[PDB]
């Protein structure tokens, strides 16, 4: 019964086509699919104004998915813009941000569950000092990118958790839920960030499974930060945060990176 819509946080290099994506579903399991419906797409072009601008309309396909191209004459310049997509039939919606960047914008990636969770589920507990480390990278001039292997069906819950513990705003990306190979889906997403969006990814955080993702991107072991105690098989492939995030933060502020 309850709507479970999501829209993808989109990051895009200036001058390039701007495409917004969304998926529209009802139910806990997304049991109902919203097929063939009109969805109106709004952008808050003046991000602090609270005023929505209608940009156009699309129709969901058989899987409830939506792809919306921003008309060239309405392309947004550099900045971060709220986006809201509204189902015309019931006035339900999804929200996300459109982030427009200059070429070569520098970013840092955090794998959510691997980087931030301390326990399993019941809201997982957050690792101590995690938020401050992410906040340190943002205040230092880096675009924050959050990736997770979870399906975007779970986006509402994941974002609520990030927001509850006060994580900095960033670009959040999930798996489509259908690939069955999340590690490669993440690697490919981050590659697309570097190749199509032209981001310069300077550091990667996660747990042991993420080393293969960051390695596939071309990150060096010194730029790869992995939570927990050193693991022998991974010895030269990454930096282990053996002492925790608080200690790691002091090391970053003495200019470790
Ligand atoms: C743990 C995984 C994903 O973990 P992260 O990518 O580290 O956020 O959860 C599911 O895929 C579901
Ligand atoms: Ca989580």
Swiss-Prot record:
It comes from the Eukaryota. Detected at high levels in brain, and at lower levels in lung, kidney, spleen and liver (at protein level). Ubiquitous. Highly expressed in embryonic retina and the central nervous system. Belongs to the PtdIns transfer protein family. PI transfer class IIA subfamily. Catalyzes the transfer of phosphatidylinositol (PI) between membranes. Binds PI. Also binds phosphatidylcholine (PC) and phosphatidic acid (PA) with the binding affinity order of PI > PA > PC. Regulates RHOA activity, and plays a role in cytoskeleton remodeling. Necessary for normal completion of cytokinesis. Plays a role in maintaining normal diacylglycerol levels in the Golgi apparatus. Necessary for maintaining the normal structure of the endoplasmic reticulum and the Golgi apparatus. Required for protein export from the endoplasmic reticulum and the Golgi. Binds calcium ions. The chain holds residues 915 to 1174 of 1243 of the full protein. This is Membrane-associated phosphatidylinositol transfer protein 1. The gene is Pitpnm1. It is found in: Cytoplasm; Golgi apparatus, Golgi stack membrane; Endoplasmic reticulum membrane; Lipid droplet. Phosphorylated on multiple sites by CDK1 at the onset of mitosis. Phosphorylation facilitates dissociation from the Golgi complex and is required for interaction with PLK1. Phosphorylated on threonine residues upon treatment with oleic acid. Interacts with PTK2B via its C-terminus. Interacts with RHOA. Has higher affinity for the inactive, GDP-bound form of RHOA. The CDK1-phosphorylated form interacts with PLK1. Interacts with VAPB and PIK4CA.
């Amino acid at each position: 019964v309850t709507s479970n819509h999501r829209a993808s946080d989109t990051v895009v290099c200036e001058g390039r086509p701007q495409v917004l994506n969304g998926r529209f579903m009802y139910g806990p399991l997304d049991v109902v699919t919203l097929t063939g419906e009109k969805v109106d797409v709004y952008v808050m072009t003046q991000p602090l104004s609270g005023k929505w601008i209608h940009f156009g309309t699309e129709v969901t396909n058989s899987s409830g998915r939506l792809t919306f191209p921003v008309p060239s004459e309405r392309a947004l310049g550099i900045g971060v813009y709220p986006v809201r997509m509204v189902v015309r039939g019931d006035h339900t919606y999804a929200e996300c941000c459109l982030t427009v960047v200059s070429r070569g914008t520098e970013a840092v990636v955090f794998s959510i569950d691997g980087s931030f969770t301390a326990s399993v589920s019941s809201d997982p507990k957050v690792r101590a000092g995690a938020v401050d480390v992410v906040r340190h990278w943002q205040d230092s001039g880096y675009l924050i990118v959050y990736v997770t292997g979870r399906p975007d069906m779970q986006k509402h819950r994941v974002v609520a958790w990030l927001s509850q513990h006060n994580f900095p705003h960033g670009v959040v990306s999930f798996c489509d839920g259908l690939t069955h190979d999340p590690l490669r889906q993440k690697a490919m997403f981050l590659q697309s960030l570097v190749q199509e969006v032209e981001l310069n990814i300077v550091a990667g955080y996660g747990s042991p499974k993420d080393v293969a993702v960051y390695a596939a991107l071309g990150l060096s072991p010194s730029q790869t930060y992995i939570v927990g105690r050193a693991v022998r098989k991974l010895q030269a492939q990454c930096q282990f945060l053996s002492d925790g995030y608080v200690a790691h933060l002091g090391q970053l502020e003495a200019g470790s990176h």
